[PDB]
């Protein structure tokens, strides 16, 4: 069974217009997200600076991917009638997403565990197992979706989606176990937010496999547009939504540390115009 | 009734020259606005850092859009006589504006509410209703103006302008209610400036729908030029004018907090060579 | 009377080489000027931070314009014999200058008034009158030089130069009145430097109208080269020379404020390896 | 004996896809690595700031090389059937690696010796011998692999690989001697990590010569793909793995200095959510 | 007597490969040098901040020039057989160097005088004479080498080299006199380093005129390659070697000032893992 790849469909001008929009909306939102990360980096204590580093990495790699894609889009389709017709650079409108996810899904795992209560070498061994399962999941997906079969083979897609799903269940179990172990050792206020943030990240991961099933089941400029919109939208919701959630946890944990004397922070911490902690001096 | 889209008009060299000017004037002004935002970010306390983050995002997304547009303009028209003739990349001189507004109008709502006296989860639920109504207004506009009909249909434009207008009235009501609730809980000096800043943002929003009515009613290189100039000018006035207004409120609220002992600020605050507050140490 | 526009002259290879040099020399010098602005931004107190912001804006807009121009130059002329022959993008070697001046001449006015002793219904009202007269002068010049007539009409150039000159006399009067009112309220040392800096900015503004009279009076690759060199040279002298002068005034005014207890500064201020003020703590 | 150069092989679309992936994965990972370096630069004391400077240089030069390569890849192969066929810009997909290594292998030597206990002019003379042996090793490799013979000659490759190997043994001896001399003068905790970091850097250097032996022994799109993947993977593991290891040593040495009174640090140092040292004031 | 210009010669693939390498090696090294400058800018006191500003300017202008050149190189030669054949953009592989030197040689003069013991107006008048003699030397060189005969005339080259040499002797005398006057007023340790740094800068200036004599005396792809390699190598040695030397002097002078109470520095100064001065508070 051969399917057409998502980049092998001619777009109606509406579709072509919608895909440029969402691609550029995403790059823009993630460049705002990068600026926000840099501007708010001093709200978090050095105990939790990994949260900022992961988030910065998520936003830079994603911005780059979406920039490349938007430029690839300009160069990858040619108007030949009422339709936009894909050329050889149209695969570059879809494939960079797997590059972005290959860095970013690992980095999201790291960000979540940044604000969890795992310490030392135990915190560095869960962190490796998660970065491995997460990269493997994306890379086995890229294999089905792009490499083996050319994205045109149903058996490839199903075998490499099924392998990717096993790495998903593994990463997810590793992460959920680590949050379940942390929540008792956190404060009630932090524990509630971390539980929510885990549900949000784990749920957002579900959306992505849906764009893979479309590629398996349906082809057309409709389905190419659907794919782009689903994935753009998910990237925005996850890489802007989840990354404020973890910043608020890191702020709150920093503040709790300031109140306990565990550390000092140079600025007051505000979360929603409520002061959490005062400025102090070394 | 079919209209020609704004990007489907040949430009006289005067028009072509005027459009490059205004497009480049806007990108330049917004890149200055970005530098100003970064340079003055320490004048505001951490309670009000969202104002800076929103403003930074407004300036980065807008600078990008205007850069893309200026380069699209170079590539989207070809001199064939005394006229510049639109090619397939001429829609890229008009469409990126809807991408910019899709981030920026939401971010302006956030910036205004940043310096208002709404706190906690109530401040995070007005903030979502406003970001929703604001994005929806732009996206329903992009649909009429670019996507459905190809920007060539009067019925599309009227239906999607009318939907966009409802989202406008909603966002505006949400925001005005929130400012009306805040002003009593602010100092007389801050309340006066926030009232002014609300009138300025709400009024500047009115200008934009006028460029949509032109596209409905009039076509030619005259009207394409008018559109570009109106929108460029509005972007400059709003994204440079309004964004100094909110920075002055945030400064003044920071200073009032410094005088009340609510927080400390590392530098003195000056507003117009009058000192508002002194430097202090944690 | 029709003249050839400056971008409508074929260049001898010497001229082509000289114009690339000066264009690239200017972009380079202004990128150094931008780095210097950022590196020295903490030498000035927050009372005088507008000086830094204006200067930063002058250097960013100018660097961009000169970059665009240098790339436009590479793509705007084609070697066809011993001569370089202008194409349709050769106007892009001359027109971006009016975009740069449109931001930068307003910003220079702001920078000069930054270190002057005005406030309230002038600090912000003289600043608007000056930004208006300054932008108007450039925009009326762009009209004669580029837009109306295509830069090929003597009557256009003379009418729009004459209008531009009235906006020049107005801006200049506004600025000179404001400096004359300030000098008595400054210290003898600051007053002397501000007088010098006013003479330098006002004098450098004179040079620019000379490139406009050349375009009126003379055409050839000689005169195109003369124009580029005069304007490049003026940009370097004014945007690097004047912008150190205002930084030294802001430093000295900061230091005087530190000695008077009007404010504190975190670092010592040195002007020419002579210490003006010591470091202090909030 | 003539071999085909690695850039002289037509790629199957799978191979073409795999090479874009790994090239873009590497550029992305190194741009994250650059952001991490900048964000964490204040965790290390000024005694050890060379570690940060070297690392920053490693990440910037590498990011540039991989960017250039990814763009060269887009422009250096053309789809002519089921195969991607190399042009004259395909050598630009392989040759920039030798530019990156020419800066980065010297910089890695400097980074390792940054956290070792060599001081003064003895520390500046081992540092030069290492930078020399390291640059020479890459440059003699570039000669065999690219310059002399065109990368198509076995005798060239073997003579210049053999010379490169001698510079490898020399650099390695210099570095290992310097670490062996340092470990007794370090704390047990730092000494253990530096021993590990030396083994990791020295071992990662071994991988690179394997891509050279492939070019000698095997040609095809298989072997071109193998080369890219091996080298991309090694770059990621070494330039992200090793550069966290040296940062942790610098942190720990900074902390030990803080506890001994040798210096003060403005922030607390955390290594794996365990506090090493407290914040202090001059 | 007509010579071929350096950009006229067809390159063998070895030469073409060697020139790309060295051009890219230089851009890379200077971009590392820029990052190092920014990272180490706080090691120097505000009395000596000009050293950092000059150095930053040297690294930015040079990085830009070398980037432009590397891209011009990709576009300025076309493979037509076993040879790479120059087009009209090949002069852009050689001419940007004169732009870089025009900023950078003036800036090097400023950097050397930054750490010398000249103060006030006397320091500002030697600084102008040096910036003039230095710019004039490069500009008179660009005239012989590029502009007057197209770089194809021996009489031009000899007359403009001879003029350039007089500006060299003048600048050098000005600078050496100023160092000779400073050394008695410096500490023995600083005086020794400044003497060395003067010899290093003055000696590195000698190398550059050798690439000019080659252009006069010899033409071929051999001699074009020689030119590029000599100049790249000199740029690396001078703009990375000399710029660490002046930073070490500025550090040491800062430290001496800290020990004398002349100023305070927020961080300890280390030079080669030996502490020069402690951190202090305003
Ligand atoms: C910000 C980016 C995120 C969180 C992307 C996540 C992507 C996934 C969780 C993808 C999962 C996949 C499967 C488990 C099925 C096969 C294909 C994949 C790679 C889309
Ligand atoms: C800085 C950008 C701003 C504030 C842009 C604002 C744009 C609008 C308020 C647009 C409104 C529209 C309507 C209500 C009618 C339909 C078309 C729109 C999208 C232009
Ligand atoms: C850094 C840029 C500067 C200070 C440029 C200044 C430009 C002017 C003062 C131009 C003046 C003009 C006239 C008064 C005559 C008509 C033409 C103009 C625009 C060149
Ligand atoms: C981050 C980059 C690294 C550490 C690259 C290292 C590269 C080498 C150690 C290469 C060694 C080579 C030989 C000794 C054999 C000849 C060819 C070389 C240059 C690949
Ligand atoms: C970092 C760049 C440096 C220090 C370049 C220096 C260049 C010179 C000292 C060039 C001198 C020349 C002469 C005196 C002879 C004529 C040609 C020149 C411009 C190469
Ligand atoms: C801190 C973590 C940041 C994200 C790192 C992402 C992981 C990168 C992994 C590199 C590649 C792994 C090796 C894959 C080799 C595949 C060979 C078979 C291809 C058919
Ligand atoms: C929500 C995902 C589906 C999007 C549908 C896109 C249809 C576009 C038709 C022009
Ligand atoms: C087309 C859909 C793209 C956006 C999906 C985002 C899903 C996030 C789910 C969040 C669940 C919250 C639970 C608490
Ligand atoms: C801090 C808040 C930042 C706000 C950024 C601006 C808003 C982000 C863009 C939201 C994207 C939503 C996408 C909706 C999908 C619609 C699909 C319809 C298909 C016809
Ligand atoms: C505000 C309205 C803008 C009017 C533009 C007129 C353009 C005339 C072109 C010669
Ligand atoms: C107090 C009232 C402030 C009113 C502000 C109105 C802003 C209008 C912007 C106009 C932009 C140019 C359109 C041609
Ligand atoms: C403090 C910030 C200073 C920024 C300086 C730049 C100001 C730009 C002002 C733009 C105003 C545009 C006016 C539009 C008029 C359109 C008329 C067209 C007639 C053909
Ligand atoms: C003062 C500027 C004069 C420039 C003269 C330009 C001559 C060029 C001749 C090739
Ligand atoms: C007393 C101050 C006098 C300063 C005069 C400034 C003149 C600047 C001219 C620079 C441009 C030259 C172009 C030829
Ligand atoms: C601070 C560490 C910097 C690391 C990068 C080191 C770069 C050194 C470059 C030196 C270049 C030497 C070239 C000599 C001439 C080569 C002759 C080639 C003949 C075929
Ligand atoms: C360890 C590297 C091995 C890479 C194998 C590449 C195979 C590509 C086939 C398609
Ligand atoms: C202590 C052992 C460290 C070994 C590092 C080796 C790096 C391998 C890179 C991937 C090559 C396939
Ligand atoms: C702080 C120093 C930075 C470097 C200064 C570089 C710029 C120096 C001035 C450039 C302009 C000189 C004017 C020369 C005009 C020549 C006209 C005749 C051409 C044939
Ligand atoms: C320092 C001289 C450099 C020599 C470069 C040319 C060598 C031959 C190229 C083949
Ligand atoms: C103290 C002596 C310093 C000598 C500096 C020489 C600089 C050489 C520049 C590189 C040579 C290229 C061949």
Numbering used by the authors:
A (entry chain E), B (entry chain A), C (entry chain B), D (entry chain D), E (entry chain C): 3 to 284
Study text:
A distinguishing feature of the group is the presence of a buried arginine residue close to the cytoplasmic face. Combining single-particle cryo–electron microscopy and x-ray crystallography with rhodopsin activation by light, we demonstrate that the arginine stabilizes an ultraviolet (UV)–absorbing intermediate of an extremely slow CryoRhodopsin photocycle. Our data suggest that CryoRs are sensors for UV irradiation and are also capable of inward proton translocation modulated by UV light.
(A) Overall view of the CryoR1 pentamer in detergent micelles and nanodiscs. In total, no water molecules were found in the radius of ~11 Å from the RSB, which is a unique feature of the studied CryoRs. At the extracellular side of CryoRs, we found a large water-filled cavity, between R99/R100 (in CryoR1/CryoR2; analog of R82 in BR) and the small (single turn) N-terminal α helix, capping the internal space of the CryoR protomer from the extracellular bulk. Aside from R99/R100, there are no internal rechargeable residues at the extracellular side of CryoRs. The exception is H230 in CryoR1, which is only found in 2 of 40 members of the CryoRs clade.
